[PDB]
Design a protein around this ligand. Structure first.
Ligand code: NI
Length: 168
């Protein structure tokens, strides 16, 4: 099922997600919708909190042919180093993009769709991607990294857009 993705200035986006207590079949259909929703909206990442499910779940898929889906449940950052930035987007901040400072290499521990722990070292798009998504889980958006004035502008452009969304 495709779930609905919240946009700013929706203040649920600022909620801190809770740890997943047990990776069961409820949890695995959240994951399956989250992918379906992600692919439908054409994103490369989605955090639970964006679909109003405030638990620590993230889906990411970089692959052209959707054959390397990545699930991060209860992710913890073990190490980071370096710094980078690309012009990031976000399904919750529709059509806006900005350069956000990120660590370049990141090492995480997380659980997969089957509640099995794993460790992932990442750089490149993956590492920026993982950081962006993890930020969602604690109520952080990428515009939080920009100037007051840059933020202001972003908020307007989006409202304008969603004004058209519910178009009628
Ligand atoms: Ni985002």
């Amino acid at each position: 099922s495709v779930l609905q993705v919240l946009h700013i200035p929706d203040e649920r986006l600022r909620k801190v997600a809770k740890p997943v207590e047990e990776v069961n079949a409820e949890i695995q259909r959240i994951v399956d919708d989250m992918f379906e929703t992600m692919y439908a909206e054409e994103g490369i990442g989605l955090a639970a909190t964006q679909v109003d499910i405030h638990q620590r779940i993230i889906v990411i898929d970089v692959s052209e042919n959707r054959d390397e889906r990545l699930v991060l449940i209860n992710p913890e950052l073990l190490e980071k180093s370096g710094e980078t930035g690309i012009e990031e987007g976000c399904l919750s901040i529709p059509e806006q993009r900005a350069l956000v400072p990120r660590a370049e290499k990141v090492k995480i521990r997380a659980l997969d769709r089957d509640g099995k722990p794993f460790e992932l070292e990442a750089d490149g798009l993956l590492a920026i991607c993982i950081q962006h998504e993890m930020d969602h889980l604690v109520g952080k958006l990428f515009m939080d990294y920009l100037s007051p004035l840059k933020q202001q502008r972003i908020r307007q452009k989006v409202e304008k857009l969603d004004r058209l969304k519910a178009r009628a």
